[PDB]
Amino acid sequence: SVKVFDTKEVQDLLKAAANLNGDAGNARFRQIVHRLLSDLFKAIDDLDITPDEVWAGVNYLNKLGQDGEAALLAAGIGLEKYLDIRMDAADRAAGLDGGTPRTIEGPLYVAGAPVRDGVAKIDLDDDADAGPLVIRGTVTGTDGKPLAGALVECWHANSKGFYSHFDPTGAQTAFNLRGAVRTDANGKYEFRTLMPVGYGCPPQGATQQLLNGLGRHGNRPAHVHFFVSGDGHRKLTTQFNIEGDPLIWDDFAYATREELIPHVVDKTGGAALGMKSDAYKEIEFDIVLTPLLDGRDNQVVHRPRASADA
């Protein structure tokens, strides 16, 4: 095995490829590209990665983007969780760690859902195998005062593990199991929905192909996603997990947190609330938001996100 990485020829090639000695441009982008390319070249040298192996990796990247699954792989190999770990460490150093814990967004948010005052019913399609579920709570600041007019958004899967706008078996109604609620004067929000089921990666897709290569499964336990925002506060990205799911501590995207597994309560009286059975489940999920530091939210994330019209 040869070792060439630390030769002038290779180091000059990397400088040229990243255009380090180029005219005034995007120095930050060039710095990132040079670092990533240098690390890749060094890894090839150290592990003696063969051309056949490299071209197989190149081919996988083609499949990954052809499948549109780069963000699913980002969750599956722990990169999305890692970003949360770094955000959590920064919050702890700054004293901005007093709110409800964050966890990963995942790749399935859809913008444009209808907004209701106080209460929203979000199961637009019938799903005989999912039972009714009420999610409710109060949004407060870290000082405990209720936040009125805060925006609570949630999205989750049906009983087959599919989300509206991403269902391969057939179109769901737009924004099925997706809603937004403006909290009332006392900070309260409530969703009436159906119970989600966990799901697995598309089995022929690039993410499952790599997981199979590693010997890992690509399943998530049942969960519900939230964004919560409000004037004067940071935007929270979080979720909760459904108690009792066998995969709850074996999520392929490493997203479960012990503080985000709320007690599920058995209730009756569902028909009066517009649910399809007398018996239903209720999950209380309170939210504590952190005030902005210096008037700016330095952890809100901009990424490509789907959108639709109601």
Binding residues, as ranges, are 97, 124, 126, 163, 199, 223, 225
Per-residue contact string for residues 107-126; x = within reach of Cl ion by CB under 5 A: -x------------------
Q: Is 308 in the site for its own copies (CB under 8 A)?
A: no
- Distance, in Å, from the CA atom of 270 to the CA atom of 280, rounded to the nearest integer, reads 6
User: Would you say 189 and 183 are in contact if contact means Cβ atoms under 8 Å apart?
Assistant: yes
Binding residues for Ca(2+): 97, 124, 126
Residue 134 Cβ, how far from Zn ion at the closest point, in Å?
19
Residue 118 Cβ, how far from its own copies at the closest point, in Å?
32
Per-residue contact string for residues 112-141; x = within reach of Ca ion by CB under 5 A: ------------x-x---------------
Q: What is the 3-state secondary structure (H, E, C) of 223-254?
A: EEEEEEECCCECCEEEEEECCCCCCCCCCCCC
Binding residues for Fe(3+): 163, 199, 223, 225
Beta bridge partners of 27: none
Q: Is 303 in the site for its own copies (CB under 8 A)?
A: yes
Tokens linked to 126:
């019938």
Q: Single out the residue of 11, 62, 173, 186 in contact with its own copies (rule: CB under 8 A).
A: 62
3-state secondary structure of 52: helix
Name residues whose C-beta falls within 8 Å of residue 284's C-beta, 6 or more positions apart in sequence. Answer: 136, 137, 262, 263, 265
Residue 269 Cβ, how far from Cl ion at the closest point, in Å?
31
Nearer to Cl ion, 69 or 184 (CB): 69
Q: Is 6 in the site for its own copies (CB under 8 A)?
A: no
Helix (H) or strand (E) holding 310: none
Nearer to Cl ion, 100 or 207 (CB): 207
Q: Is 236 in the site for its own copies (CB under 8 A)?
A: no
User: Would you say 122 and 310 are in contact if contact means Cβ atoms under 8 Å apart?
Assistant: no
Residue 171 Cβ, how far from Ca ion at the closest point, in Å?
8
Window 88-107: residues binding Ca ion (CB under 5 A): 97-98
Name residues whose C-beta falls within 8 Å of residue 218's C-beta, 6 or more positions apart in sequence. Answer: 76, 200, 201, 207, 208, 211, 252
Interface with Zn ion (CB under 5 A): 106
Q: Which stretch binds its own copies (CB under 8 A): 112-120, 173-181, 212-220, 273-281?
A: 212-220
Tokens 């959590």 found at: 88
Q: Is 141 in the site for Cl ion (CB under 5 A)?
A: no
Residue 106 Cβ, how far from its own copies at the closest point, in Å?
12
- Distance, in Å, from the CA atom of 274 to the CA atom of 194, rounded to the nearest integer, reads 12
Nearest-5° Cα angle at 193, 189 to 195 = 120
| Residues lying near Ca ion in the complex (CB under 5 A) | 23, 97-98, 124, 126, 170
